[PDB]
Amino acid sequence: AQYEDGKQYTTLEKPVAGAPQVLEFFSFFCPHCYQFEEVLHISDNVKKKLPEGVKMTKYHVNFMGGDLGKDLTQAWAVAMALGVEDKVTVPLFEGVQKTQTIRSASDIRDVFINAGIKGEEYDAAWNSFVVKSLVAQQEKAAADVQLRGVPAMFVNGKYQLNPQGMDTSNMDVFVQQYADTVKYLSEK
């Protein structure tokens, strides 16, 4: 066939019930994730090809960057709760990986303040039980699929994108192939 298990995607031999339809995992410590976000705009190009009615979910993971990695997962929970994902994603990536000016929770907090989220509002979110369950969800979703690497994408809790198996000669072509694959998997 044109799309084959083990080529553009793999199948979970233990499928995850009730899973979000398009589920993406990343870490701000993750170098390919930086590329995926900044250079390739993967999430965005997948969205453009996804069907009517499909919701896209993106979660942070703990297994990179130790103590700061966990701070970052809670911070992404704050971002999701406040709906400010689109204002902190880039400065968080560049702060961790480009300028290396993020070294503590307080530095993560600075990024939000600079993006215009108010101190009171950030700190209140940070400490809220709604953010606690949001953290809980990110971990559960990762736990459910045995996740040990990022960037990672899952479709309807049964298929896992396999970017290793796509041509990287051309960045644009890699992205479309990636997005079309999510679409194919989506319609499956």
Structure characteristics:
monomer; 188 residues; Glutaredoxin; five-stranded mixed beta sheet; 5 strands
Could you please describe the fold and organization of this structure?
With 188 residues, this protein is of the alpha+beta class. It has a single domain (1-188), classed as Glutaredoxin (3-Layer(aba) Sandwich), CATH 3.40.30. The protein has helices at 31-39, 42-49, 66-82, 85-98, 105-114, 119-126, 129-144, 171-186, and strands spanning 9-11, 22-26, 56-60, 152-155, 159-161. Strands 1-5-4-2-3 form a 5-stranded mixed β-sheet, with helices on both faces. Helix 3 packs across helix 7. The longest helix is centred in the middle third of the chain and has 17 residues, at 66-82. The two termini are 14 Å apart.
